[PDB]
Write a protein that binds this ligand. Structure first.
Ligand SMILES: [Zn+2]
Lengths: 64, 51
């Protein structure tokens, strides 16, 4: 639904790299370069953003 | 002055309309076969050890 606040395996905080991730992808950067530029070194964190599906943007479209 | 049976026909013709076959080219697929999954060029390591 919404970005998890902390990576499940480690506990690293990834809930503040969602908008930065989206901004570096709009600038032309690959998902690899983008996840690198955010400080997500170990692949447990990289999967937390790489495979996130933002469904809070589709629920926030039906009437109040 | 009536109609009488005449001589038996000597043959029969059966007509049908038929078109012909073209050359065998056998063009199986636009982009054919199962194209293989493959390596992204260069790639580079996306991880390092500590120290
Ligand atoms: Zn992690």
């Amino acid at each position: 639904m919404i970005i998890p606040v902390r990576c499940f395996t480690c506990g690293k905080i990834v809930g503040n790299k969602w908008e930065a991730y989206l901004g570096l992808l709009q600038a032309e950067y690959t998902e690899g370069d983008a996840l690198d530029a955010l400080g997500l070194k170990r692949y447990c964190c990289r999967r937390m953003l790489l495979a996130h599906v933002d469904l809070i943007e589709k629920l926030l479209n039906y009437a109040p | 002055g009536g109609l009488t049976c005449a001589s038996a026909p000597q043959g029969t013709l059966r007509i049908l309309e038929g078109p012909q076959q073209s050359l065998s080219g056998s063009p199986l697929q636009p982009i054919p076969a199962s194209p293989p999954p493959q390596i992204p060029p260069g790639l580079r390591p996306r991880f390092c050890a500590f120290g």
